[PDB]
Amino acid sequence: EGAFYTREYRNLFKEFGYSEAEIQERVKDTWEQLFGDNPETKIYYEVGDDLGYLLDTGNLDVRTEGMSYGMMMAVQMDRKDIFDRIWNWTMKNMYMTEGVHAGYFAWSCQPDGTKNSWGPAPDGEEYFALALFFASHRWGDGDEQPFNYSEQARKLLHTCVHNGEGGPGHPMWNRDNKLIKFIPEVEFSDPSYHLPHFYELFSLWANEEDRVFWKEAAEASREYLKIACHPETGLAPEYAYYDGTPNDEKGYGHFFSNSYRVAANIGLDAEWFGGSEWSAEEINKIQAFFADKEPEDYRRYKIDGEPFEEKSLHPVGLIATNAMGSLASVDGPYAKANVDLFWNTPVRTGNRRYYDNCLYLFAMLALSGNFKIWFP
Ligand code: NI
Numbered sequence: 370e371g372a373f374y375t376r377e378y379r380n381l382f383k384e385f386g387y388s389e390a391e392i393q394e395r396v397k398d399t400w401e402q403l404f405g406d407n408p409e410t411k412i413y414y415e416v417g418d419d420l421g422y423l424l425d426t427g428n429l430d431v432r433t434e435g436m437s438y439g440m441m442m443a444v445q446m447d448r449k450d451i452f453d454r455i456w457n458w459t460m461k462n463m464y465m466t467e468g469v470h471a472g473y474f475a476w477s478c479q480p481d482g483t484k485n486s487w488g489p490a491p492d493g494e495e496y497f498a499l500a501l502f503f504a505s506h507r508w509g510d511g512d513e514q515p516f517n518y519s520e521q522a523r524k525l526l527h528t529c530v531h532n533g534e535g536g537p538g539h540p541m542w543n544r545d546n547k548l549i550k551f552i553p554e555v556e557f558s559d560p561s562y563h564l565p566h567f568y569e570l571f572s573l574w575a576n577e578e579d580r581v582f583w584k585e586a587a588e589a590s591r592e593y594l595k596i597a598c599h600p601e602t603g604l605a606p607e608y609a610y611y612d613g614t615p616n617d618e619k620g621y622g623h624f625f626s627n628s629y630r631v632a633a634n635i636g637l638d639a640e641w642f643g644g645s646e647w648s649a650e651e652i653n654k655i656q657a658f659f660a661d662k663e664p665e666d667y668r669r670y671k672i673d674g675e676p677f678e679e680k681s682l683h684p685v686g687l688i689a690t691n692a693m694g695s696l697a698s699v700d701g702p703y704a705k706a707n708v709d710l711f712w713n714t715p716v717r718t719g720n721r722r723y724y725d726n727c728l729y730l731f732a733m734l735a736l737s738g739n740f741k742i743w744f745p
Contacts, residue, residue, distance in 0.1 A: 371643040373569070378738035379640060381696060385708050392737050395712075399733045400446055402716045403726055409718045412726050413439060413451070414480075420461070421454030422480065426723040427682075430485060431478045433463060433493025438727045440500035445734055445741065449508050452500075453516065458482075459497070460515040465489075469537050470553065472528040491541040491549055492562045494529055498522045499567045502574050503743040519574075526575045530582060543611070547582065547589035551608055557616050560597040560605040561630035563590040566638040570742065591638075595647060598631065599672040603654030605631040606672050615672060623677070624670045626724060629687050632694035633728065637735055639697035641742060648697040656691060656703035664688060664714070685717045685725035689732035696735060708736060 372378045382392045402410040412435070415421045423435035436459045443452035462482035463474040473489035474497070505519035515521055532538040532553070539553035551559045565587040572583035596613030598605045606615035607627035615622030632655050639648050658674060659667075667681035681687055692711035695704040711732060717725040734740040 371639070371641045373641050373742055374643075378741055379696065379699070380738035381699065381708060381736045382712070383738075384699070385705050387712065396733050396737050396739060399716060399730050400442075403442075403730055404448075404451065410716050410722065410726065412723050413455075415454065416458065419454060420458045421451060422458050423455070423727075424480065424723060425477075426719075427721045428477075429480075431458075431462075431480055433459070433474045433476050433490050433497070435723065435727065436463065436474075437493045437496030437500060438731075440504070441496055442730055442734075444500050444503040444507060444743065445739060447507065449504070452504055453511075456501075456504075456515065469539075471536075471538065472525075472532060473541075473553070488552060489541075491529070491552065492559070494525060494541060495549070495562070495564055495567055498526050498529075499564075499570060501525070502570065506743040506745050522574070523576050526571060526579065526583075530579050542582075542586060546611055547586040548593055548611060549586070549590070557608060557610045558593070559608050559621075559627055560594060561607070561627045561634070563594055563631075564634060564638075565590040565594075566634075566641045569642060574745075594631070594635070594651075598651055598654075599674075601654065602658045602670075602672065602674045603632075603651050604628065604658065604670060604672040604674065622672075624672055625681070626683050626686070629683065629690040629728060631690075633690040633731060633735070636693040636696035637740060640735065640740075644697060649701065650698075652694040652698040653701045653703070655694060656698075656701060656707055659687075659691060660703050660706070664710075682721060683725045683728070685714055686728035688714050689725070689728040693728075693732040693735050711736070 404413040412423050422431045423439040425432045425435055436455055439455045440452055462478050465471050468487045470487055470489050475484040476490035477485040501518045501522035510517045510519050529541040532540045541553050542549055548558055549562045568583045568587035572580045575583055597609050604624040605628045606622045607625055608616040608621035610616050635648050664684050667684045669677040669679045688711050692707040695707050698704055716729055
């Protein structure tokens with residue numbers, strides 16, 4: 370039974386023999402390397418007294434993926450100061466009041482706040498919403514907008530479901546199949562965006578008129594991952610059609626950066642809402658696939674496992690996600706090896722560090738029993 374029910378979170382590092390003191394130290398150190406004055410590893414930058422952002426180092430921009438991640442990290446770490454800095458920057462610079470995506474958040478901005486696009490990225494929105502609910506529950510709603518966290522969350526999820534009913538906009542979920550979309554104007558998806566464990570919580574906390582929908586989306590997403598993951602290797606494509614098969618029209622049909630998150634998501638869903646035979650077997654497949662492969666040699670792979678010449682752009686993120694997946698198969702043949710590999714992998718430095726280090730901190734939180742549900 371999941372932590373949602375027991376309110377006890379598995380400390381998998383501890384269960385696998387790491388000391389409580391060393392785990393505590395490693396979690397704090399990871400946070401400090403990302404959010405403190407450690408220029409080589411840092412991804413969070415403070416602006417003035419009331420702003421802050423996470424920098425996508427690989428593209429020199431600020432993304433809703435990163436900002437929503439940073440808010441989730443901040444609430445998990447009980448850092449309202451950092452949470453509010455990031456959320457303030459997000460509302461000031463990213464929230465759109467004009468155009469077909471009014472009510473959503475521009476997916477990419479320059480560090481100065483200028484929007485690079487008026488298109489949103491749904492995986493940002495869903496992380497903003499849950500981070501905001503958690504903020505409301507840990508700290509209480511603030512008296513001034515936009516710090517009325519729970520209202521902001523419910524408003525945002527309203528738009529995600531209902532956009533287009535009163536205007537030219539489009540929803541971020543397909544209303545018929547209850548699946549999250551890659552972007553509002555397309556009819557295909559991205560397996561890594563599927564967060565059934567978030568949707569379960571939305572089914573308790575969103576506007577009441579959408580609570581049944583959110584339960585249905587949770588179930589739809591669990592079913593969708595079964596068809597999207599390769600049956601032998603467990604590998605999911607970056608983009609996939611609603612039928613579960615890869616969308617490779619622009620090269621996103623393979624196992625690469627986006628896909629890494631699928632294992633992590635399965636891990637966290639198992640911890641929060643309970644294990645399943647499917648999830649255990651799926652993590653066992655991915656870990657089996659990587660068992661005989663060196664991190665230095667990790668590639669892009671077709672989902673059937675065929676390797677490309679191209680190396681993984683984010684091999685540390687791949688390590689972190691595979692290790693976080695162990696929460697879904699704690700007795701799995703490779704579960705300990707994956708957790709140990711992660712323990713022995715430092716936080717990343719250099720221009721490509723942002724994505725790896727985000728996945729890294731999520732894995733550190735989850736594997737130490739510190740990626741929690743914050744209830745009202
Ligand atoms: Ni120590």
